[model samples]
Target: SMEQVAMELRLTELTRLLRSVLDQLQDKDPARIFAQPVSLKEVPDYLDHIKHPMDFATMRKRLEAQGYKNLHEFEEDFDLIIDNCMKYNARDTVFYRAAVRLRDQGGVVLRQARREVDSIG
Candidate 1:
């Protein structure tokens, strides 16, 4: 079952890369607001402002469930998270500013992953 082993290895490496990106994001946020989904009860207007809300917890859940076929998909969700925050919060707000930083840092990690992994491309 060499093919099976190869497939498993790919999955393991991919998840490792994904986890690294996710962990970096979690660490960057001091409030850890991006770590979980935005609560509607706390921010009732969140859903109205963001058409597609995404969070790190959801991303982690999907990653474990094999929700992303490639790194691109994972990055898409990351963009969605950043975009949602940028749109919902004003530019001067902490949330919006954090999203900007997350996008910049996440992009670097993503590019690093792109260089490290080949088959997923």
Candidate 2:
């Protein structure tokens, strides 16, 4: 139950990130590209999909908006934040579960990326 709760919290954080990504994309005011709408409700299934579209480009833009100058910088900053969160609050079962869920979702994204590359080749 602790694991499940943690996963939910992690998913919630991810949902926040996904929402933030969508919001930033809207603010960019680029061409009206009607991509698949991603929502918190769809996160579980969508995160499991291998070819849901949108990737690091979207992430890069979001990080940039948060003041990261480049991918490397963003990674560094993000790693620090994550590390601190885990190090300081690791005992928080809810937070730990959330971290695990986020990590699992990231793995899904990587798997999806690999599949997409395979399909394209």
Candidate 3:
């Protein structure tokens, strides 16, 4: 899966990120983001399957720090990162930065996705 890597990939972490995202939707915006009766899951079935997560929280920080833009530009930038760098391990630097790019760019896109969700339920 050279299309990817990092954090050794944990579904739970991705779940946390996903739920953190859901948590941002107006705190019960009547949007019904989750369609099931939820008394048993942190995230959901879909996000729980991302095998190689790249530290979504960190990515969001990095992106917002840089005045992030659309995904097309972000993807181009991320590819450049992958194309230009590598560390002894793939955890912090790679996954973190790649995540930064994605978080900045789009797709699950963080339009400062963290702008207002930092102090919530």
Which candidate number has the best lDDT?
1
**Which regions in candidate 3 have their CA more than 4 angstroms from the true location?**
1-9, 26-109, 114-121
The whole-model C-alpha lDDT of candidate 2 against the native structure comes to 0.42
lDDT by residue (45-104, candidate 3, tens digit) is 523433222332434454445423333443454333333323312457643454344434
Query: Which ten-residue region of model 2 has the weakest summed lDDT?
Result: 28-37
Candidate 3 local lDDT, residue 33: 20
Tens digits of per-residue lDDT for model 2, 1-121: 9998876665455445444533443343233222223343845554454233333344445544544332344334333323433543456566445444444444444455335434643
Q: State model 1's lDDT.
A: 0.83
lDDT of 1 by residue, 1-121 (tens): 9999988878877888788877876777767869899999999977778888899999999998866777789888988999888888899998899999888877777777878677454
| Model 3 residue 46 lDDT score | 25
Model 1 error, position 111 (Å) = 1.6
- TM-scores for all candidates? 0.85, 0.33, 0.21
TM-score of 2: 0.33
Residue 7, model 2: Cα distance from true site in angstroms: 40
Candidate 1 TM-score over all chains jointly: 0.85
Indicate whether candidate 1 or candidate 3 has the larger lDDT. 1
Question: Which parts of model 1 are misplaced by more than 4 Å?
Answer: 1-5, 119-121
Model 2: how far residue 116 lies from native, Å: 12
